Design a protein around this ligand. Structure first.
Ligand SMILES: N[C@@H](Cc1ccccc1)C(=O)O
Ligand SMILES: N[C@@H](Cc1ccccc1)C(=O)O
Lengths: 266, 266
């Protein structure tokens, strides 16, 4: 007899990592809203990570990010236009520096979303990591207002949690935005207010840093008569609440018994 | 010796059909503009294919579509709300009937794009087919104007052919739109004006047919104070110009030597 219910050739079946899944969904959501995804480098200079974003040194505000400083010659970090740049190297503490790199290399109006791995010197536990992911958002152009930032997050919530979903905005501080704000979303199933990220209207000094670097590079100013909003949200926190994952350390853990569990969600 | 440059296990490598590729790119382009993709049935009733779209019978305008009529009992065609519907069956001669199905099942404002296989009784040659594909576009809502239709096509052209690309609109006739129009795009490489499809502001009678079917079904009217634009473009013509394909008959031909050639473009 030709047993048809017998195991067939053991061809391998692949899968995508949960962060890749979460990031993808997040990118899909924003693509539908007109956002384009671009990435930045993990090793940045203090200039892009801090100074260009209105976060000076010995600044009590620079303590909001526990930085990993680097050392070593021979490494050539290129700027927005491929040009080699200088400054104390570090691991970006957020994706925000990409806001600056992009703006000097392009012209408004535009919509970008920049995903990426970030690093912060912290003790890795159940809900904390030294290595995680963020997703930046940047929309610049004439007449761009905070009403648009609120509109963006509102669409994010709807797409993420359904029609019974809602967002709340509260003032908060960031050197690169003003007005500044933190936003939370209403997750119906969990019946809880989830804090997703921060945002605001691009700070006046950011545009100045951008155009200053531009002239210093030969390009003409492109940000004097425009405004914009930016936002940044943590990927793991969201991936966890969405795939029901208890420990954030698994993401980098490597357990196949763990990763394999997302072959379904592709 | 362990020859490392020797052929490895012959694992199969798949691929996607050129129309799937073209359709995907077209859907990606419109998703970025806020459009969502929904499909309709290939076997339609005269009501959705013609009557609901202001194309009555014995109408000199109904001759713009060479219809394939069908026969046979036992077949149960369901309407927008799953309800069984009646009328002379046929193979849709375009995707347009989906405009009607969607509108009765949802509420404005929205943006849809409906891809799909269509059929027309014609002699299949080098640049003609009885079985091809179209991509519909429908955007409805308060204050929606033709300026938006032109804006849509403009973005389509840019995304498809680059910044040196441009679109031209000329009046043309369609029973389901008014104003009516045909649009062509400027393809820089070929230095020629390509005619892509037709479009216009949803015809007043279409909205009426929609709301009439709605009440006849218990739903409340939803299209009395809105306007909208619609467009439809041929997929093969575009796929051909874009992948440099000479004969439109290949698509359905089945030659692996042909299909295999698009494993690259995924
Ligand atoms: N970079 C910020 C997030 C953020 C991005 C953009 C604007 C405002 C806040 C952080 O690490 O928290
Ligand atoms: N259905 C039309 C195309 C079209 C769609 C929508 C509006 C106008 C024209 C055709 O077959 O040519």
């Amino acid at each position: 007899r030709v047993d048809v219910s017998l195991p067939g050739a053991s061809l391998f079946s692949g899968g995508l990592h949960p962060i890749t899944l979460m990031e993808r969904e997040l990118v899909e959501i924003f693509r539908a809203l007109g956002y384009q995804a671009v990435e930045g480098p993990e090793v940045e200079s203090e200039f892009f990570n801090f100074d260009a974003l209105n976060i000076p040194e010995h600044h009590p505000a620079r303590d909001m990010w526990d930085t990993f400083w680097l050392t070593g010659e021979g490494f050539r970090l290129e700027g927005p236009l491929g040009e080699e740049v200088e400054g104390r190297l570090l691991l970006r503490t957020h994706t925000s520096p990409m806001q600056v790199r992009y703006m000097v290399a392009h012209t408004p109006p535009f919509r970008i979303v920049v995903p990426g791995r970030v690093f912060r010197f912290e003790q890795t536990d159940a809900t904390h990591e030294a290595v995680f992911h963020q997703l930046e958002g940047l929309v610049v152009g004439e007449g761009i207002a905070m009403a648009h930032l609120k509109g963006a997050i509102y669409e994010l919530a709807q797409a993420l949690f359904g029609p019974d979903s809602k967002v709340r905005f509260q003032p908060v501080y960031f050197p690169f935005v003003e007005p500044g704000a933190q936003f939370a979303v209403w997750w119906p199933e969990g019946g809880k207010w989830l804090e997703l990220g921060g945002a605001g209207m691009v700070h006046p000094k950011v545009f100045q840093a951008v155009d200053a670097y531009r002239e210093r590079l030969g390009l003409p100013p492109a940000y004097r008569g425009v405004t914009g909003f930016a936002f940044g949200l943590g990927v793991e926190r969201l991936a966890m609440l969405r795939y029901g994952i208890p420990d954030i350390r698994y993401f980098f853990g490597g357990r196949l018994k763990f990763l394999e569990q997302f072959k379904g969600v592709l």
